[PDB]
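Researcher: We are triaging several targets before committing to wet-lab work. For this one, the compound of interest is OLC. I'm pasting the protein sequence and the ligand SMILES. What I need is the predicted three-dimensional arrangement of the protein with the ligand bound, expressed as structure tokens, so it can go straight into our comparison scripts without reformatting.
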Amino acid sequence: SGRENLYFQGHMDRLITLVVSYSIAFSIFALATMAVVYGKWLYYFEIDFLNIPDLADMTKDEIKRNYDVLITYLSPFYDGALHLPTLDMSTNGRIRFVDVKNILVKIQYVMYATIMIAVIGGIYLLKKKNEKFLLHGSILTIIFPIALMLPIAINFEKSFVLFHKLLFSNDYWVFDPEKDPIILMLPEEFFMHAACAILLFILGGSILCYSLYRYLVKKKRMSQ
Ligand SMILES: CCCCCCCC/C=C\CCCCCCCC(=O)OC[C@H](O)CO
Ligand SMILES: CCCCCCCC/C=C\CCCCCCCC(=O)OC[C@H](O)CO
Ligand SMILES: CCCCCCCC/C=C\CCCCCCCC(=O)OC[C@H](O)CO
Ligand SMILES: CCCCCCCC/C=C\CCCCCCCC(=O)OC[C@H](O)CO
């Protein structure tokens, strides 16, 4: 009965490596996203770099406290509404930031799931002297954030319509600086730089996981 019982098991660890490697890819993507979204140093740098005080007709102290309040609001543990210290906000502006908050709690929710599956299924594979999930995952974390960008290559303007309508509850509403002046201290350059910082953290994440794959496999070879 052994023949038929390892044809099954070999295809099992092959699948488990797949689920674990994809779980590591998303876990690193979500961790990097959370580090940049809730990190303050990048935006604090953009204040002087992009001259946000003159962009928004605000002082630096006002920009930072309004930003600090926004990031506190986007945490999944703050149940209160968004109250900017010195800025007005329209009904559609509050709707937009609840949309932004909702994807973050969605990403974190799935992140906690993938982290557990990656570490639980990962030690099951390490107990079996199998390390390729640290290698398969390593390349998969580089490939995950970019597979989300693939629709851009088919149609640039059109597939940004798809992202916008999957995330946001108001199709047609745009930020009016008179009614939602926080838009003037969130320039487009900050969001692109933030996306680059996410991939930077993702790239660094795959390196350490690849380094772990090679640390494990060299010890495994120096044993046999
Ligand atoms: C040695 C094996 C490691 C096992 C032990 C560590 C396992 C956790 C793994 C990564 C850290 C993830 C921590 C959870 C990140 C919280 C998500 C988050 O930061 O959101 C909260 C808030 O919005 C922002 O301040
Ligand atoms: C997209 C790449 C990921 C970037 C990582 C995020 C880092 C930003 C930090 C906190 C969120 C700030 C609140 C988000 C503000 C959204 C404003 C908006 O809705 O877009 C502008 C609108 O299209 C014009 O009218
Ligand atoms: C290498 C790229 C890595 C991909 C990383 C993508 C992560 C997206 C997931 C959550 C973002 C949550 C915050 C959503 C903020 C979007 C607001 C926005 O994009 O508006 C900017 C606009 O272009 C000017 O105003
Ligand atoms: C079992 C597989 C082990 C694989 C080993 C690779 C682990 C990758 C760890 C970090 C890279 C992601 C970069 C994210 C930078 C730190 C993320 C973080 O934990 O901070 C969250 C933030 O502080 C919330 O407020």
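Researcher: Any quick observations?
Model: Residues 2-221 form one domain.
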